[PDB]
Amino acid sequence: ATAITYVSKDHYFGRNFDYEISYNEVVTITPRNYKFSFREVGNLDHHFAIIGIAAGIADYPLYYDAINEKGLGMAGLNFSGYADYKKIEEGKENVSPFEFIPWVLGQCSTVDEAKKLLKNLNLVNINFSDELPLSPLHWLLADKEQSIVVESTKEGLRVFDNPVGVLTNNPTFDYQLFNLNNYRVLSTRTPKNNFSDQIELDIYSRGMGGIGLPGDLSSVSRFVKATFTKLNSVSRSSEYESISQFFHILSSVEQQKGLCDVGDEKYEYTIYSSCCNLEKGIYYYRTYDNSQITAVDMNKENLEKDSLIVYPMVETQQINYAN
Amino acid sequence: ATAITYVSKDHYFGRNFDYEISYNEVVTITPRNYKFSFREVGNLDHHFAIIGIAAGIADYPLYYDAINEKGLGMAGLNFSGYADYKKIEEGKENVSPFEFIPWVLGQCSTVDEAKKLLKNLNLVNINFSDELPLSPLHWLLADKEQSIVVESTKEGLRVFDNPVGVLTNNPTFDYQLFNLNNYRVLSTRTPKNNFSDQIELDIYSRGMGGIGLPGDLSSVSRFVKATFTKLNSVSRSSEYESISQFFHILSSVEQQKGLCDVGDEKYEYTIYSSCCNLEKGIYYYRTYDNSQITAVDMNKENLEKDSLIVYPMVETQQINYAN
Amino acid sequence: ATAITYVSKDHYFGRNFDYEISYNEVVTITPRNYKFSFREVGNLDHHFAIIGIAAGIADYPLYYDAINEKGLGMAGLNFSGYADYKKIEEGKENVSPFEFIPWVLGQCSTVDEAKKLLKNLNLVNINFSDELPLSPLHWLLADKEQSIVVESTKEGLRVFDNPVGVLTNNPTFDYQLFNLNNYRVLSTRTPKNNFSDQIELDIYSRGMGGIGLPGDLSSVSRFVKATFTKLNSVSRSSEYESISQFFHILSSVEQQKGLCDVGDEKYEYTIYSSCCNLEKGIYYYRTYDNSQITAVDMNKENLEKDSLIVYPMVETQQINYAN
Amino acid sequence: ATAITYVSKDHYFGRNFDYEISYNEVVTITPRNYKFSFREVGNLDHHFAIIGIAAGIADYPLYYDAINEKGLGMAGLNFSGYADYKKIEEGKENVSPFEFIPWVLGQCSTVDEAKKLLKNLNLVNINFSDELPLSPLHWLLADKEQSIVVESTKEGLRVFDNPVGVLTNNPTFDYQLFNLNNYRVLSTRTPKNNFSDQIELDIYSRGMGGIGLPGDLSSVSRFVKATFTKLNSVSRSSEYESISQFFHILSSVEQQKGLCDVGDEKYEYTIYSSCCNLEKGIYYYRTYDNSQITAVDMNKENLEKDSLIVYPMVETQQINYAN
């Protein structure tokens, strides 16, 4: 996975969902009066409305990523081997990873509010159901001002400020940021010939500034290439142009089918790519085999409802036969 | 600035068009009886029908790339500083670069027939007009059996068999192919720990087999990355799944706006991407700010016509509002 | 700097000393009855004899690296920006970095003994003298069984087991080890063509397995290249052949003059390279402008002495005119 | 397997000899009146005196590299799979590779005189003997003014001006030079943060300007690394300081035993390194297991002699026991 923030005029939030198998992903709107029952903390009978992509395998909104009606977003990204979920700790707010998105997004408007919430958190090892055990995750949260990373590992729970608004998979966030230091020299412009003033070296291609940028599908490579691509991105401020640029940043680090064998000839690939407009409450997506962007606008629903509002994803190619 | 071939069940041909300015690109169908008048060779009054993208700045089809009704495709790619066009040579077929796609695709059904034609070619330095002078180019041609590269440089005219079905920009094709030798180790599978059997190295990420693949936007890096991506691609044989994979290979080496500064704060970016089904005569495309695939089927036109059939490109984002 | 361990039959320990200026380095033997007066801990009036390289600028042995007569070695390596020395802490053994080598090597025979010693350590910010303030360091310690790294940073004091027997400069040791994970694929043997079974790639050179090994002079690059070079090293077990291999591992990551500008046209370069035989008590060195190995054997001195025994370094080239 | 030129005040020429087996390498001085009998060209009964390293397996001087008394040097380097030696061609000077160093150095004082000679050359496939068949090679020649490369391949005989004064193994020299273009950015100074002005990247190490330089033992990587090292070298003008720097450039790309497995657990390693002072006629060398520099001065022999003057190499470690 790769999650990013972007700002044009509005602020956007989204991610590539990379995996080798697809669990009936759906677009789910959780309206305000859908009661959240939590295993070990107080219930939220009334809360902020949420829209995101969820696993359509349960009668409860099992979000992979989502935004709320106040412009706060959250995404869980694979952290296999690194994530560590705890036993119940008296005096903490004991929240399972499966509940975590609803817990934050239901009651926080801003990253600053979530930071307050997160001081008393303990992420506990409680499965949604017996058939649907917990996945090892870490999290990106963002709003119109900033982003944070939440990692629960063997060492404990850490919350990081995220200066680049990017996240991928392993290893821990401190290492990802540090590694950026190695790529200081990368540029959008052609370099001078620093190698020697005694010889002429030819500028035989455009794009030479970026030489050294990693193009493989591993976690750290993708972090570096998505961060470069995001921070050097230019687009106009119109909504369609801004989401176009955003999906181009996500494309830059998508996983093509065939390229990442995870064993037994199964392939990790970019099942879907999302872009959420935090001001407008619009969840945009593309899927591996549907290039057209599809938009679901949470504000078009009745957010006073008490039941999930579920949209199947348009997963097959929508061609414009012009002619 | 990347052209490729791909085979699933049907065979496909297409390209990214990367440049810093967009000159009224249109989809042009040249029907069979549109007379081709050539500056220094015999005219083609009747010829094979052609579909491609052309510069919509002239009343002659100035193709950037195209396919004909017999399943032969051809594309011109920037080769600045490398291309050399010649004086007229008595005893050669003297064809200008602006005429070259009509010349080959009007009369050849296969790459083998083009190879016969190319033995007598001399690419000549004659402009379409003073207002529209020649661009430095090289070409990829491909059919359902194979692909070749055509380069006219200071050293002369060379035609290469293309064992990977990819082409980018500079330098010459022999160097591009040679450079692939440096990447033998790259894999879709996790490597063994060859580094040392005396220590344990952790597999902390998927996709580690690709470490080393270059992710910058320069010519040679994109060549390597598109080749690796193409050759290791997997998809089902259905038309929509096949073209989806094709566009994903082109996306792997597209150029995002902002990342390649060419001066005067102008940026080289991927203005459009095409995929052509050689068996079906369908030209599919996506543009920088329209992610939906748009299809133009040459076979829906009257190919016995006399005049060019010109379609504007769908350039703004075609969004599926699903609620 | 780069410090390493190596084993053939005997166990060796040594380092490159890389800096931009040379402080009258000398080979100093500290015999058993040279009283060590410590600023804040108990004195060592009698202790193990030590041989190493020291700054010949003071009447006290200011070791850059040394071994003792029991086969325990220690080296300090630049850690600028990372090292943090503390205030005096009641209940700790408060030892200044300038005293640290004498403190450990004077009283420990083995790394296990030093680990015991190090549990109560606090490295304190006390200068040797007013003219000779403390340098930011971290440390490698080794004996015939194992090696450890000692880092005192803002976070605190950490002692790491060192599975590869290498150290360089920044950043912290955990990051260096982690980074090795990225180089799992590197090999002494030619790789298979994993890139594609559809094309022939030519083995045009020997040594292709190692492609990806970094060759720059930065700290992390040197760590990776010295670790690869050490762990894949082969030599015979004879003393001269074993030290030859050891100096070849150090050469692999030396800093040539001119290549590392540190500002004002001053250059960080490998002032000297050492190799110490832990069993025999022999300190071998080469300097930048003397390629011949020079050997100082501590066991040839009277180790019951009470005064430093000081050898100037042979710093100019010793040529054998044969023829 | 790396040859270089270097200038301080005097001019120097020399090489690493990298191979997996050592065949009685000796230092051979060919005096002026040692008759050269050539297989297919006129004999040189009187010629310039030559000093170099030769295979001590024949009563003819089979040089790996050498210089003559007029300050012209020449070296043959492995070019396996690339070299092509020819049938005898009437009207050419037909010279076998085993004769080629005598042929040029016996009669030419300068690279310009060699260029005149080489216009009529045809390198012929004639073995010294059945027991000692030809090796595939290419050559670097150099004097106090310039250097050139000579390659005989399937395509023919080519002579290139060498703008960097380096040569390694495969592939052809035009590709080696071209590849340098990819390294324009590399610097001896710390880079600016070009990556993004929106974030702070820490300069955690010296030598970050070189990041990207390749550190593996393959041909092309060593070419790049030796070129960067050579061109950015600094030293004083004194003979001992100059040769010290020279040997440091060769050390930057030497091959440590164990790191290049060529099969049958045989290893390609740097058997010897030479540096020749062209003005003085001195051959200096180091060997894998002798780090001390050994000098052989051709001018101390009687150059009017008739017979080869042969010195065994000092191959075991010459240690300075300083106590």
Short mmCIF file of N, CA and C in Angstrom, two decimals, chain A residues 248, chain B residues 1 15-19 250 253-257 268-273 286-289:
data_model
loop_
_atom_site.label_atom_id
_atom_site.label_comp_id
_atom_site.label_asym_id
_atom_site.label_seq_id
_atom_site.Cartn_x
_atom_site.Cartn_y
_atom_site.Cartn_z
N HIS A 248 -2.27 10.37 -10.54
CA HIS A 248 -0.92 10.22 -11.15
C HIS A 248 0.16 9.98 -10.12
N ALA B 1 6.62 9.05 -24.32
CA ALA B 1 7.94 8.77 -24.82
C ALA B 1 8.36 7.31 -24.55
N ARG B 15 1.65 3.64 -27.04
CA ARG B 15 2.72 4.51 -26.57
C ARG B 15 2.24 5.57 -25.61
N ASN B 16 3.16 6.05 -24.78
CA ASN B 16 3.02 7.32 -24.13
C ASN B 16 3.59 8.38 -24.99
N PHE B 17 2.87 9.47 -25.15
CA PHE B 17 3.33 10.68 -25.83
C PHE B 17 3.69 11.68 -24.81
N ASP B 18 5.00 11.86 -24.60
CA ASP B 18 5.53 12.74 -23.54
C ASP B 18 6.14 14.01 -24.13
N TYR B 19 5.65 15.16 -23.73
CA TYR B 19 6.18 16.41 -24.25
C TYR B 19 5.74 17.50 -23.33
N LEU B 250 2.13 1.09 -19.51
CA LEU B 250 2.44 2.47 -19.86
C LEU B 250 2.46 3.38 -18.64
N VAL B 253 5.78 3.93 -16.50
CA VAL B 253 6.81 4.86 -16.95
C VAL B 253 6.22 6.19 -17.44
N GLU B 254 4.96 6.53 -17.05
CA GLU B 254 4.53 7.84 -17.39
C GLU B 254 5.25 8.95 -16.67
N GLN B 255 5.12 10.17 -17.14
CA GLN B 255 5.78 11.33 -16.63
C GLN B 255 4.79 12.25 -16.02
N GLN B 256 4.81 12.37 -14.68
CA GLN B 256 3.95 13.25 -13.98
C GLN B 256 4.32 14.70 -14.09
N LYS B 257 3.37 15.61 -14.20
CA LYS B 257 3.61 17.04 -14.36
C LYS B 257 4.26 17.54 -13.11
N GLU B 268 7.92 18.32 -19.15
CA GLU B 268 7.60 17.18 -19.99
C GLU B 268 6.71 16.20 -19.21
N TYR B 269 5.50 15.95 -19.74
CA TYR B 269 4.57 15.05 -19.07
C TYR B 269 3.88 14.18 -20.14
N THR B 270 3.20 13.12 -19.71
CA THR B 270 2.53 12.18 -20.57
C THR B 270 1.15 12.73 -20.99
N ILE B 271 1.13 13.40 -22.12
CA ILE B 271 -0.10 14.06 -22.64
C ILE B 271 -1.14 13.08 -22.98
N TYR B 272 -0.79 11.92 -23.57
CA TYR B 272 -1.73 10.88 -23.79
C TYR B 272 -1.02 9.53 -23.79
N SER B 273 -1.75 8.45 -23.58
CA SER B 273 -1.32 7.08 -23.70
C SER B 273 -2.26 6.34 -24.62
N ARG B 286 -6.10 7.13 -23.27
CA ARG B 286 -6.30 7.92 -22.03
C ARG B 286 -5.46 9.19 -22.18
N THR B 287 -5.88 10.28 -21.58
CA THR B 287 -5.13 11.51 -21.57
C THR B 287 -4.79 11.94 -20.15
N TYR B 288 -3.85 12.89 -20.01
CA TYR B 288 -3.34 13.25 -18.71
C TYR B 288 -4.48 13.52 -17.79
N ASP B 289 -5.48 14.31 -18.29
CA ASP B 289 -6.62 14.66 -17.38
C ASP B 289 -7.96 13.94 -17.71
#
